[PDB]
Amino acid sequence: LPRPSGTYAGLPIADYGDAPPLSTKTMFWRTSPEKLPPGAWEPAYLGSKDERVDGPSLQQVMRDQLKPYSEPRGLLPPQEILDAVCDAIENRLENTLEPQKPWTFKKACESLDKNTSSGYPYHKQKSKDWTGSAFIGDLGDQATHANNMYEMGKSMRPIYTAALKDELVKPDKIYGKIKKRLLWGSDLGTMIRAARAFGPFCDALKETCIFNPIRVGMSMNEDGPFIFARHANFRYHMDADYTRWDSTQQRAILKRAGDIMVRLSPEPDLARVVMDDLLAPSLLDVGDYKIVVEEGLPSCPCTTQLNSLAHWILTLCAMVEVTRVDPDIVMQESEFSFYGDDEVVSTNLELDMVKYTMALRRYGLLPTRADKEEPLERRQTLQGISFLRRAIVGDQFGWYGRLDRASIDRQLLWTKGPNHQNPFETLPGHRPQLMALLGEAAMHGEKYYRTVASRVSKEAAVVPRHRSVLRWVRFG
Ligand SMILES: O=C(Nc1cccc(C(=O)Nc2ccc(S(=O)(=O)O)c3cc(S(=O)(=O)O)cc(S(=O)(=O)O)c23)c1)Nc1cccc(C(=O)Nc2ccc(S(=O)(=O)O)c3cc(S(=O)(=O)O)cc(S(=O)(=O)O)c23)c1
C-alpha cells in the first residue's frame, strides 16, 4: 500500500484518514413541544439523515468549508510597517508581562480540557484515560512520547481531525444555503507540546488581560466594566466584523505572531520547534483522507492567543498605514480588544475609514458593514458595539456587557443534553445555567424581567425580586 494522492476539495491528498465519521447528531433539545416562532434558530444541519431538509452529505458540507483554504492569500502589509508594528507590540508585551517559570508536563496534562476528544490517533474522550492526576494507557503513552520530543527539541507533525460545529444557527443556514462551521481537532501530542511551550506565555498574557488588548481569559462581569471604561476614554469606536477570519489568514502573519510568542516564552528554543510545527503546512484528516493545508489558521485551543496576536498585528498595520503615525503613538491614542476574530477598536485618531477598509481587504480580510451594504463606519459613542456575544452598555454606574433579548429567548427554547437525531424532541427530566439567565434579563429592566421570570418559573414542570437580582449581577 502506497500513500494515495490527488485532490480533495481543491487541496492535495497526502494520506489515508483515520478520522471517525462526522456526527449526524445534535446536543440541543427543545424545552417545550410547542411550535417554534417564525425564523427561530435551530441546531445546525445534521446530514442526509436530517428529518428537516434534504440537503447534501456532511462531507460535502465540510468540503464547502475548506474551499476558501485554497483561495489565494491577500497581501502582506508593507515590510516597513510590519516591522515597526511587530517591534511595538513586542516591546509592549516586554514591558507588561511577568517572566514565567517553565510549564511542567504535569501542568500541561492538567490544563487540557478533559471532556473533548484526544484526536489522532486514538479519538477517545481525554477522560477515558485520566486519573485526576495523569494520563494512563494509550493517552498516557501518546503524552509521554510527545513530552520526550519537546524536551529534546525534536519535530513532530501535528495531525488535525476535521469536524463540523454543532450549534444554533439562523434558519437560512438550514433551509436556505446550508452551512456548518468547520473545526480542527488537534491531536493530544500537539496539545501537550503546545501546552508546555506556550502555556507560560498564555498565563502571563492572561494576568494582564486588562492593560493589554488580548482579552482571552477575561470575565465579562468582573472585567467588562473596567475594560469598556478604558475604551470610552477615546473619541472614536468601531468593530470591523470579519467574515471567515480563520480561513483568510496568512501564515506569513501567523509566523510573525508566532515569533513574538516564541521570543517571550521561558524556553524559546523548545518553543521555536513547536511553533514551526504548528505553522508548517497542516495535515488535516477529513475522514477517508489526510490532506495538506498550506494556508489559513487551523480553527488547537492555544491558537486563540496566536489568532488574537495576528489580529493585533493586522489592525495596528492598517491604522499605521492610514494615519502614517508610529505604532507606538497609535497605541498611545487607542484602546483595543481582541478575542480571536472578535474586536473593538477605540481611538482618538481621525481614521480615513475608506483607506482603512481598503487596507483590511487588501490584507485578505473580509470586514463587513453593520448594515451589510457596499467602507466601515465609526461612531463617537461606544454604546452599540458588541464584544464576546454581549452588547456593551453604559449607565450611571458604568459599563457592562448585556446579552441581547434574542440570545436570552433562544437560550429558553433550547437546552443541552445527550446527542440525538431530532432537535425538536423535548428532553425528559431537566437545569442549574437557568440561574445566570434570570441575571441577564434583569439588565433589560423590570417589564422584560417579569416576562422572563414568567417563563423561568413555568419551567418547574424563589424567583428573586428584580431589585435583588439586578444588584447581584451588576455589582456582586
Ligand atoms: O460557515 C459559515 N461561513 C462559511 C465559511 C466557509 C465557507 C463557506 C461557504 O459556504 N463557502 C462556499 C460554499 C459553497 C460554495 S458553492 O458550492 O460554489 O455554491 C461556495 C462557492 C464559492 S465561489 O464564489 O464559487 O468561488 C465560494 C465559497 S466560500 O467558501 O464562501 O468563499 C463557497 C461559508 N458561516 C457559518 C456557518 C454556520 C454557523 C455560523 C454562525 O456563526 N452561526 C452563528 C453562531 C453564533 C452566533 S452569536 O454568538 O453571535 O449569537 C451567530 C450570530 C449571528 S447574528 O446575530 O445575525 O450576528 C449569526 C450567526 S449565523 O452563523 O447563523 O449566521 C451566528 C456561521
Side-chain angles (χ1 to χ4, degrees):
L1 265 78
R3 302 256 267 184
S5 54
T7 280
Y8 187 90
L11 298 142
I13 289 159
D15 202 342
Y16 294 104
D18 291 289
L22 307 174
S23 175
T24 70
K25 295 175 179 176
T26 187
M27 61 175 142
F28 299 100
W29 299 65
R30 287 277 286 121
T31 51
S32 146
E34 211 206 68
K35 314 311 164 304
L36 238 19
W41 300 35
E42 298 179 29
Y45 171 79
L46 298 173
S48 65
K49 292 193 204 281
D50 197 315
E51 309 175 46
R52 303 168 296 182
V53 262
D54 304 317
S57 74
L58 283 164
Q59 297 68 221
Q60 177 56 226
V61 167
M62 172 157 70
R63 279 196 287 272
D64 280 14
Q65 294 289 117
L66 295 166
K67 274 162 180 70
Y69 274 101
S70 65
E71 223 43 50
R73 286 313 85 175
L75 300 173
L76 213 50
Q79 214 62 56
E80 206 149 336
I81 282 156
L82 238 205
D83 294 335
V85 164
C86 269
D87 286 1
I89 299 161
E90 197 169 343
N91 205 277
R92 186 183 179 100
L93 294 175
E94 262 169 20
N95 288 348
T96 53
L97 297 178
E98 219 73 67
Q100 309 281 299
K101 301 267 88 191
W103 259 35
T104 67
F105 176 53
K106 185 202 179 75
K107 211 136 167 44
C109 278
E110 176 73 69
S111 55
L112 272 20
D113 180 333
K114 305 295 184 317
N115 312 315
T116 48
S117 181
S118 71
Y120 185 87
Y122 305 105
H123 311 280
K124 61 160 81 180
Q125 191 168 115
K126 285 186 217 63
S127 69
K128 286 199 68 185
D129 274 13
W130 185 254
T131 64
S133 60
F135 280 106
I136 56 172
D138 302 340
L139 265 43
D141 278 346
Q142 176 164 23
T144 296
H145 174 71
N147 187 242
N148 287 328
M149 303 290 281
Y150 169 83
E151 295 179 354
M152 294 172 73
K154 302 311 285 286
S155 168
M156 292 198 72
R157 184 76 173 270
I159 288 189
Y160 295 90
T161 295
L164 299 155
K165 197 181 171 76
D166 178 13
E167 82 196 310
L168 274 25
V169 297
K170 62 147 174 169
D172 186 43
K173 277 163 175 69
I174 300 148
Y175 301 105
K177 173 70 261 190
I178 284 177
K179 283 167 202 193
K180 203 169 172 171
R181 288 213 300 285
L182 160 73
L183 314 153
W184 301 51
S186 167
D187 66 88
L188 175 93
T190 296
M191 272 170 161
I192 289 288
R193 300 198 295 133
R196 284 209 76 176
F198 308 110
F201 180 83
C202 298
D203 273 352
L205 206 44
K206 202 188 88 65
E207 286 173 27
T208 62
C209 86
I210 280 169
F211 299 100
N212 284 140
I214 298 156
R215 270 38 226 259
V216 168
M218 70 168 278
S219 163
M220 184 47 69
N221 298 86
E222 317 164 59
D223 307 312
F226 191 171
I227 290 169
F228 309 138
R230 300 171 54 90
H231 266 95
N233 290 319
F234 301 86
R235 189 157 176 209
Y236 302 102
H237 312 97
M238 68 196 79
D239 175 354
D241 195 12
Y242 296 102
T243 294
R244 297 190 284 279
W245 172 268
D246 288 354
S247 55
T248 55
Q249 283 315 107
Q250 299 193 220
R251 291 291 165 114
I253 293 299
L254 300 177
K255 283 135 158 142
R256 297 305 295 265
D259 286 339
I260 293 172
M261 299 179 49
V262 163
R263 246 108 69 167
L264 290 172
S265 279
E267 312 203 82
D269 301 288
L270 272 20
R272 168 53 62 200
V273 186
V274 185
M275 192 34 82
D276 286 2
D277 283 345
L278 256 27
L279 287 189
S282 308
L283 213 35
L284 217 213
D285 197 324
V286 300
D288 284 340
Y289 288 113
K290 299 192 190 84
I291 70 178
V292 176
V293 1
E294 252 106 38
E295 281 286 350
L297 186 272
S299 306
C300 174
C302 85
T303 63
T304 309
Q305 258 101 348
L306 171 74
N307 205 31
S308 289
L309 202 42
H311 201 324
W312 194 349
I313 297 165
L314 258 7
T315 299
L316 196 51
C317 273
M319 288 173 85
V320 173
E321 229 183 80
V322 173
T323 72
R324 320 201 67 245
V325 186
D326 304 53
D328 263 324
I329 322 299
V330 172
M331 299 191 80
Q332 282 181 239
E333 298 296 321
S334 321
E335 180 69 31
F336 301 145
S337 281
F338 308 113
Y339 198 123
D341 66 333
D342 206 25
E343 65 153 51
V344 181
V345 178
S346 294
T347 193
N348 299 329
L349 303 177
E350 295 282 336
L351 247 166
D352 186 342
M353 296 309 302
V354 175
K355 281 169 164 182
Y356 179 71
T357 312
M358 231 154 62
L360 298 170
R361 298 213 161 104
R362 189 221 306 147
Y363 300 158
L365 317 166
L366 306 171
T368 83
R369 294 181 34 99
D371 66 10
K372 300 186 220 305
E373 309 270 342
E374 290 180 316
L376 295 151
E377 285 217 68
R378 94 206 170 187
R379 272 313 309 156
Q380 250 142 284
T381 193
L382 177 61
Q383 303 230 41
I385 291 143
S386 260
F387 193 58
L388 271 20
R389 322 183 298 105
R390 305 281 151 91
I392 299 159
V393 177
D395 63 28
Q396 60 277 178
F397 303 112
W399 293 96
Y400 58 115
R402 185 174 61 187
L403 197 53
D404 60 298
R405 289 174 180 252
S407 302
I408 288 148
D409 290 338
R410 199 181 310 142
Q411 278 190 47
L412 288 167
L413 301 152
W414 306 94
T415 183
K416 292 171 163 216
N419 284 330
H420 70 315
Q421 196 55 57
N422 177 14
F424 300 138
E425 280 175 11
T426 80
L427 179 67
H430 309 281
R431 54 200 207 241
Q433 216 169 311
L434 196 60
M435 208 81 74
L437 220 45
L438 217 42
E440 290 289 354
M443 304 184 278
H444 289 101
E446 190 225 50
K447 56 191 174 295
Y448 178 76
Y449 179 79
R450 264 212 220 197
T451 66
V452 158
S454 155
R455 292 169 76 177
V456 167
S457 282
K458 190 175 45 54
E459 212 190 85
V462 60
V463 51
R465 297 192 173 188
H466 162 61
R467 171 68 18 245
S468 184
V469 65
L470 185 56
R471 166 176 61 248
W472 186 85
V473 76
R474 277 307 289 286
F475 320 109

